[PDB]
């Protein structure tokens, strides 16, 4: 059969991933421009939301050295690929878990609906890639919203998960943090309540 050049193989990002990709977290000075966890400036259109979460291993212990990358549509359901710290909104961001508490945060807007390749609307989602010590190739997941039940029920991606119980692992929980709209999205890498991870 036809064989292409093989892809460069993945390796773990390691425990010191912050040196390279989360400079403040390593305890190091930052450069003039850094790619970080504030996707939306205050005057970006859409519903402004705080996202937060913890990451658990198979023994139910916090993964305190997690590194996360996120990709989401703007409030109008459009992906903005021209990354610029001047923009009121960027579709891409990065975050990491605190070493003490194990919590990551993101400041963004709720993404609008995007259609799949067949033209079927997907429920509002944030694409997440998870990297860490002990993770040899990053894990892909999606964060959906518990206040989008009707859309979630119809999502052609959610519906590819064979067991209904597992779909629940991708639904973030709406709450309030200091009077502001928030969602919690915990990830369980392994075992009871294991988060669905995707291949594509």
């Amino acid at each position: 059969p036809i064989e292409l050049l093989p892809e460069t193989p993945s390796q773990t990002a390691g425990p010191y991933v912050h040196i390279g990709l989360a400079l403040e977290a390593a305890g190091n000075p930052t450069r003039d421009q850094e790619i970080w966890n504030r996707l939306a400036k205050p005057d970006a259109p859409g519903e402004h939301i705080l996202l937060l979460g913890q990451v658990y291993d198979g023994n139910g212990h916090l993964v305190r050295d997690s590194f996360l990358e996120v990709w989401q549509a703007d409030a109008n359901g459009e992906y903005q690929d021209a990354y610029n710290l001047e923009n009121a909104f960027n579709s891409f961001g990065r975050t990491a878990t605190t070493f003490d508490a194990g919590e990551w945060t993101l400041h963004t807007v709720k993404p609008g609906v995007v259609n799949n390749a067949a033209g079927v609307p997907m429920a509002p989602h944030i694409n997440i890639s998870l990297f860490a010590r002990g993770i040899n190739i990053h894990l892909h997941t999606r964060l959906y919203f518990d206040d989008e039940a009707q859309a979630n029920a119809k999502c052609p991606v959610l519906n590819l998960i064979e067991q209904p119980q597992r779909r629940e692992t991708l639904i973030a929980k709406r709450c309030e943090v200091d009077g502001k709209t928030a969602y919690r999205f915990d990830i369980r890498i392994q075992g009871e309540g294991e988060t669905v991870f995707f291949d594509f």
């Binding site: 292409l4 190091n28 990358e69 990709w71 890639s129 040899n136």
Partner: protein, 238 residues
């Protein structure tokens, strides 16, 4: 805004390291036990950030000068250079390449590294660059030293530099580690050996590149990166 106009060759997850590789002990509790769920590519997966207008500092790619505290860092001066292409052999221009590493003695500038080898006051350990219009990147740095770690009772990482590459979509994004030609620690490392296929391990070994060296100044290593092949859509929804 970005649009869905391409498809990316499916990953070979027997070429990449598997999730559960128990000799690398931390992988035991940090690997999923359920199968990954395969989904079709949509605009969510086939698009990604372009960093053309991220503002890079003058020395962002030069680790000999980007942590200057009154001198040059100690250790083997090297250029690390290469090309980013996809599996069809097409260059990947204007893509973000990030790298980080320990110093010459295997000590990382990170609050969590307590290895007894000293920090170097003029070494930070982080670089970034955008590939040029032909897919080439280059960094100047010092060769990192091996690093012991608490895996088995006498485990030592080979000299290595971490690389992160964005590529054209979140589907192509990759983090990997570069190793150095001939390092006798490579065959012994449980992180290297998370990769089952020895031919895949070879793909991570940077080759000494005398052709690219600066005489009386610095050596050079070459590390080419291959991201997932990108093709146009064809015969979809018909």
């Amino acid at each position: 805004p970005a649009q869905d106009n391409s498809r990316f060759v499916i990953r070979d997850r027997n070429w990449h390291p598997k999730a559960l590789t128990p000799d690398y002990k931390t992988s035991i509790a940090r690997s999923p036990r359920q199968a990954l769920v395969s989904i079709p590519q949509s605009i969510s997966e086939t698009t990604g950030p372009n960093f053309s207008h991220l503002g890079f500092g003058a020395h962002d790619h030069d680790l000999l000068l980007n942590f200057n505290n009154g001198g040059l860092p100690i250790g083997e001066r090297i250029i690390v250079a290469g090309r980013v292409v996809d599996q069809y052999g097409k260059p990947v221009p204007n893509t973000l390449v990030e790298m980080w590493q320990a110093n010459a003695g295997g000590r990382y500038r990170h609050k969590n590294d307590r290895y007894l080898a000293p920090l170097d006051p003029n070494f930070g350990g982080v670089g970034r660059c955008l590939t040029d219009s032909d897919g080439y990147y280059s960094f100047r740095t010092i060769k990192p030293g091996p690093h012991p770690w608490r895996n088995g009772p006498n485990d030592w990482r080979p000299a290595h530099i971490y690389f992160g590459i964005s590529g054209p979509s979140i589907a192509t994004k990759l983090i990997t580690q570069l190793y150095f030609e001939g390092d006798p620690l490579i065959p012994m490392c449980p992180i290297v050996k998370s990769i089952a296929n020895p031919e895949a391990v070879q793909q991570l070994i940077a080759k000494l590149d005398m052709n690219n060296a600066n005489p009386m100044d610095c050596l050079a290593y070459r590390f080419d990166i291959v991201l997932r092949g990108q093709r146009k859509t064809h015969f979809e929804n018909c």
